[PDB]
Symmetry: none
Subunit: 147 residues, 4 copies
């Protein structure tokens, strides 16, 4: 039974280590209790004291024994990447998506946003003519807008 993050590989960790990833979809990162089969057969239970409120992030270190590591890998998904032109537009989009109850993530740049691809959201985004592309891509839990 895993209890706490031993932090995240991002704090290198230039491996250096054999790393056995657990593979999560973006929406799975928030369970406190769940059972997993890691990439290399292994078994892993989790119960979380202080599960970072926004969820598990990329490479969160679940387990660490010697150089033997287990970390969180977040699977890629179809993602509508949104490029708003102005602050007025950001507001429009967010409100409108919020109204849709779809999920929404901050993008890499200041007017960029990412949301799971769904066709109604897509339809919406064109109806208001915002500039967007669908890419298979990663959605970091730490990028999510709470709600």
């Amino acid at each position: 039974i895993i209890e706490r993050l031993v932090g995240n590989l991002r704090d290198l960790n230039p491996l250096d280590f054999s790393v056995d990833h657990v593979d999560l979809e973006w929406f799975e990162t928030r369970k406190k209790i769940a059972r997993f089969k890691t990439r290399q057969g292994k078994d892993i239970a989790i119960r979380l004291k202080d599960a970072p409120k926004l969820g598990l992030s990329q490479g969160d270190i679940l387990f660490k024994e010697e150089k033997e590591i287990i970390a969180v890998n977040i699977l890629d998904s179809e993602v509508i990447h949104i490029q708003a032109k102005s602050v007025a537009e950001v507001a429009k989009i967010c409100y409108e998506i919020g109204n849709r109850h779809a999920a929404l993530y901050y993008g890499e740049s200041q007017f960029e946003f990412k949301t799971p691809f769904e066709k109604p959201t897509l339809a919406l985004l064109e109806k208001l003519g915002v500039q967007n592309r669908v890419l298979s891509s990663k959605l970091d839990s730490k990028e999510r807008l709470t709600v």
Copy 2:
């Protein structure tokens, strides 16, 4: 039966005219068909060809006979005035309010937004520590965020 905006007093019109106002609440600006009793007793019927989608605005000229005018006043209401500090914060507010299905309007400056007062909306805005004030004020339909 009134049919047409003869425009809006904002295009002066330095009155100049005895103006009898019809007094609408903000949520009332969007009927196409309804009946009214103006400020000074009179009676008005409306059916709208091209009712500006966003609804009736402040001083939309309903009726114009000589210097005798009837127009739309919009009554003040309790309003939460929201002042976002960042574009990050804008996004968060709008998403969260949209997620609540509350109404939202653009503010006077760039990170200002106005939403009707409701206690849950307020509760929300504190929970996120956004800086806001409740003021009795006017909501322009021209200032609203759609939902399409």
Copy 3:
């Protein structure tokens, strides 16, 4: 200041009484405090102890002095009347309207339901091909499906 329902004219009351109605839209039925001008000039203030949770209903007797009565009238409104085939269909309708966050009322019969007319709601009801008709009609607050948020 009016305080209690003295009931409702439905408990006849075959008038018998000069009745002066107060006219409320279906969404207004739930203020505990507000002021009114009745149908024949009169003025009424309200403050409610035990405002029946769902709101004021049709002909809720506000005021009763002799045979002189004031009651609640509920402005008839545009209403989609829904006639469901089967329980399955009921469940589909209710879930889908619920999902829309529209308002919903029990009809007269078992598979009848009433909801305010909105064009997307109608659109929807055709998209599923449910049988309905729009009528101008009353929406009794006692007939509402509640909600908890």
Copy 4:
């Protein structure tokens, strides 16, 4: 190589008779048109779907069939609130209310039965209204879903 059509469903027996390799899906995964899978017995399978049944892949949809060698869809079980409504009024209430929550909703085995994923608020609600329900580890067939259009 790539799978294109359902060759139907085992339900149309098929009293196996066959060695059947299943593909194991969660109930939310039944609606991808393009994805890659490793079957129960290691095999590899890609899908692209013309006329993917709108509501999703169902229990035992035959992806692949070569001789007596078969690949079918299995839907993994999950925690499931099983709801047993006493009346048609109560169905409507439940569905509208859940609809309003935006929870997922499936037709049960019997007429007044409905199944929705387990979540604690959905539970919370269901008691608040005093509906009779039980949580059970079980299967949510995609064909049993209440749309939303």
